[PDB]
Amino acid sequence: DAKNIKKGPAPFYPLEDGTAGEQLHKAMKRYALVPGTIAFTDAHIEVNITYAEYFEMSVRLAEAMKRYGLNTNHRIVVCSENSLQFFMPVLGALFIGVAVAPANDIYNERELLNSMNISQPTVVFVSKKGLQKILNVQKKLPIIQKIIIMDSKTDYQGFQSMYTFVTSHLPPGFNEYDFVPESFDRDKTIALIMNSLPKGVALPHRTACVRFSHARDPIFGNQIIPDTAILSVVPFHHGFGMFTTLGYLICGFRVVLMYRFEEELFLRSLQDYKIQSALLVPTLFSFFAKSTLIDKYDLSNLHEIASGGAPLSKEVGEAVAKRFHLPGIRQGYGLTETTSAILITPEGDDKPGAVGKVVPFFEAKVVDLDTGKTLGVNQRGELCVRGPMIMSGYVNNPEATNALIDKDGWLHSGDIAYWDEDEHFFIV
Numbered sequence: 001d002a003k004n005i006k007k008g009p010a011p012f013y014p015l016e017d018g019t020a021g022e023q024l025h026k027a028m029k030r031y032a033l034v035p036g037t038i039a040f041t042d043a044h045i046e047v048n049i050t051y052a053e054y055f056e057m058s059v060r061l062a063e064a065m066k067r068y069g070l071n072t073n074h075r076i077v078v079c080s081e082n083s084l085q086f087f088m089p090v091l092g093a094l095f096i097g098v099a100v101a102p103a104n105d106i107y108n109e110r111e112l113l114n115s116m117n118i119s120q121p122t123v124v125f126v127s128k129k130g131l132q133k134i135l136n137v138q139k140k141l142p143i144i145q146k147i148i149i150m151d152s153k154t155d156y157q158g159f160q161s162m163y164t165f166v167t168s169h170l171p172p173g174f175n176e177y178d179f180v181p182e183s184f185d186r187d188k189t190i191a192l193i194m195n196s197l198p199k200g201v202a203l204p205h206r207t208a209c210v211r212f213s214h215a216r217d218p219i220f221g222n223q224i225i226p227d228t229a230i231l232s233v234v235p236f237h238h239g240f241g242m243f244t245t246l247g248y249l250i251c252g253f254r255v256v257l258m259y260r261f262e263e264e265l266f267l268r269s270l271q272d273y274k275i276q277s278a279l280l281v282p283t284l285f286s287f288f289a290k291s292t293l294i295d296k297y298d299l300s301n302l303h304e305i306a307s308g309g310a311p312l313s314k315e316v317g318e319a320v321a322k323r324f325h326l327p328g329i330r331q332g333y334g335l336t337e338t339t340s341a342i343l344i345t346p347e348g349d350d351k352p353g354a355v356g357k358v359v360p361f362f363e364a365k366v367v368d369l370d371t372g373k374t375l376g377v378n379q380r381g382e383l384c385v386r387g388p389m390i391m392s393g394y395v396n397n398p399e400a401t402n403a404l405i406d407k408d409g410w411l412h413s414g415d416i417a418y419w420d421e422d423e424h425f426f427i428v
């Protein structure tokens with residue numbers, strides 16, 4: 001019964017060809033050619049970095065990694081708190097087809113070791129505060145040949161920074177604007193290995209390309225408008241942070257980041273940066289349902305709040321929307337294994353407690369927990385989705401992959417849901 005399979009509509013703009021690296025490179029080069037266009041802002045230290053700076057450093061890192069000897073057979077780890085530098089090695093690696101494994105920066109040595117035993121990186125990019133943990137991990141994982149310090153200009157404790165690493169490897173006369181990213185099969189070449197003991201979730205370049213279609217979709221994402229700023233406190237090494245931020249770079253937005261939540265800084269940032277959209281996780285929603293400071297700030301520019309990371313209760317969402325003077329909350333539902341959200345609230349068509357509608361290129365159904373039958377409108381069962389953002393599999397764990405994804409390509413989410421007469425989905 002096809003009528004009970006909910007399908008996303010066609011994307012507003014056709015899906016572009018090219019790897020995720022090629023698409024990011026093309027967009028970022030465009031924004032780079034306009035001086036002063038801000039890519040990231042660190043709300044804590046107040047420093048801005050422009051698309052020109054970001055584009056040039058990411059391309060220099062790409063070329064330096066290529067000359068050092070990395071290619072599609074290798075992986076890198078990026079282990080850092082949210083920062084201005086976080087996406088430099090991410091973009092550089094995407095530009096040359098090297099898979100990136102972001103490691104949670106609050107993991108201890110044991111958890112890092114398990115994570116990197118799965119991803120098996122050749123080079124680790126780490127912030128200064130993570131260096132000791134990586135050195136302890138490297139003791140057990142000799143495959144790590146090289147450690148590069150992200151948030152330093154000069155060498156740091158005998159290790160190269162991204163800047164000195166680049167100088168060591170760039171050819172004379174290197175031209176960042178002549179550089180061309182690598183081309184490769186985007187279904188076969190892994191872009192990210194995300195953590196989900198945790199497993200490693202392999203995401204081909206294809207899944208990011210589809211994400212970039214959603215991110216700028218006028219219905220399922222944000223319309224590309226000049227001078228748009230987002231406030232993001234969500235960890236970049238988690239899918240909600242990783243894939244919203246890459247999407248924002250495609251859109252040329254200003255991404256104001258925080259690496260630690262604080263109430264006054266968060267609200268003052270919304271006000272002073274004239275933020276249009278802010279990203280929260282459910283426990284920060286619960287926090288703002290308790291906040292009374294919100295009405296002391298001028299939030300007249302705020303258009304939306306998005307919640308991701310885990311389903312949000314209906315009542316908490318309604319409380320927060322009211323405190324912020326918004327008509328509703330921009331919800332979505334995703335898993336690490338689906339790259340990002342594959343149900344998203346359509347712009348202007350929020351419905352309290354709903355996680356939204358099936359995104360372009362996807363299908364979703366709910367199945368009876370007994371009969372396995374596809375269910376109709378307003379009936380509760382297991383949410384199952386199928387589409388090109390689904391992971392290629394858990395790394396070196398085909399049994400775990402097969403337990404989650406069936407022979408027809410349906411991923412079984414483990415969550416109970418239903419959809420309504422407008423094809424809005426609700427998580428129960």
Ligand SMILES: CC(C)(O)[C@H]1Cc2cc(/C=C3\OC(=O)C(c4ccc5c(c4)C[C@H](C(C)(C)O)O5)=C3O)ccc2O1
Pocket residue numbers: 196214215220221222238239240241243244247306307308309310330331332333334335336337339340341344345
């Ligand atoms: C407008 C706009 C911003 O473009 C769109 C894009 C968008 C995404 C979401 C929600 C999510 O996006 C995500 O990626 C995840 C997610 C990603 C990984 C993941 C989990 C959730 C749960 C699971 C766990 C480990 C439990 O955290 O892993 C979301 O919930 C909500 C609103 C929204 O507006």
